[PDB]
Structure 1
Amino acid sequence: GKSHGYRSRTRYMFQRDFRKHGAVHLSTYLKVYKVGDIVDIKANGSIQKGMPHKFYQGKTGVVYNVTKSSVGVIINKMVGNRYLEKRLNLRVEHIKHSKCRQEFLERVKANAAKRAEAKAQGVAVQLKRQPAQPRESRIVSTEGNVPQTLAPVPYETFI
């Protein structure tokens, strides 16, 4: 019959990296997680306790609870035609801080600095990002760069 065990189809997902087996480095256990931090989930195959289910591999959530060796993460899961909130009790070895927003905090700091320096001098602070714009006009010189003519090559075998 069919098999739908807890760790089914996880042959490669939970493997260690090549030449990266063994004990976990100490910086994993020294990081500090607080309620409200954004973390991403990546199960470590050598730690069988506090291991997330395979569905949450590669998912990002928000910490809501902090315990002795584990944290609680909030995950929104799409079930049917709606999203339901899932609460996971995961050990710290299976998570890490998310860099998707640490850079955003830098832009928040930079916006305030540019907002303040323009507060006394210039109107229209212009603190909004823009997408890539079409290129402006330019002049290309041929001094030492005379164009060289190219032609299609004939067919050859060279086997």
Structure 2
Amino acid sequence: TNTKGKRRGTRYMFSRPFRKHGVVPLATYMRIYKKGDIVDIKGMGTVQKGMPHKCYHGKTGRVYNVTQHAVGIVVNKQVKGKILAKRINVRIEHIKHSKSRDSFLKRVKENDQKKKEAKEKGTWVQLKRQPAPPREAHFVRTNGKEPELLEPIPYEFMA
């Protein structure tokens, strides 16, 4: 049976990617995190202080507490039957913002702007993202030439 080590099975998971070992870049240390920010976890082997556990590598949570070097975040960890909204203290360089909220934030700013606009203009605009519809009818122009005839090649053993 397997050992229950804290870092068991993380040979390739906390290791630094190829040719980017070395000193941590400092924008990582300069990014500021409010509370309630959606934030991704990705642990990193260069700093062992404040290591997130291997259950959380690649999970996304929400900041509730910011200390002077670390943030506390609430992640959903799935254990056997239930999903636990549990809170962990991660030091600042194992963590990075998520753009998954930012795309929605751009969309809510844009559609609230085009709801402010085109209200007194009488028109009614589409705001719900309809899915990718079937392609409507269209003429394919064969400009002159015949379509090329394709037919399967005879078998030759190349090896």
Report the TM-score range of the alignment, normalised by the length of the smaller protein. over 0.9
Q: Percent identity?
A: 58
Q: Which runs of 5+ in 2 are unaligned?
A: none
2-side partners of 1:143 and 1:42: how far apart? 54
User: Residue by residue, what CA displacement relative to the aligned partner does 1:72-102 show, whole Å, maximum 9, x if unpaired?
Assistant: 0001222232221211111110000111111
Give the drift of 1:149.
Answer: 1.3
User: Residue by residue, what CA displacement relative to the aligned partner does 1:23-73 show, whole Å, maximum 9, x if unpaired?
Assistant: 111101110101000100000101000001100000000000010100000
Q: What's the counterpart of residue 18 of structure 2? A: 18
| 1:71 partner SS | strand
Amino acid at match of 1:39: V
Amino acid at match of 2:102: Q
| 1:61 partner SS | strand
Amino acid at match of 1:63: V
Q: Which runs of 5+ in 1 are unaligned?
A: none
User: Residue by residue, what CA displacement relative to the aligned partner does 1:100-129 show, whole Å, maximum 9, x if unpaired?
Assistant: 111111001110111111111234332110
The reply to whether residue 37 of structure 1 matches residue 37 of structure 2 is yes
Q: What's the counterpart of residue 78 of structure 1? A: 78
TM-score under structure 1 length normalisation: 0.94
| 1:39 partner SS | strand
User: Residue by residue, what CA displacement relative to the aligned partner does 1:124-158 show, whole Å, maximum 9, x if unpaired?
Assistant: 33211011011111111222342111212111123
The reply to whether residue 94 of structure 1 matches residue 94 of structure 2 is yes
1-side partners of 2:141 and 2:123: how far apart? 39
Amino acid at match of 2:37: D
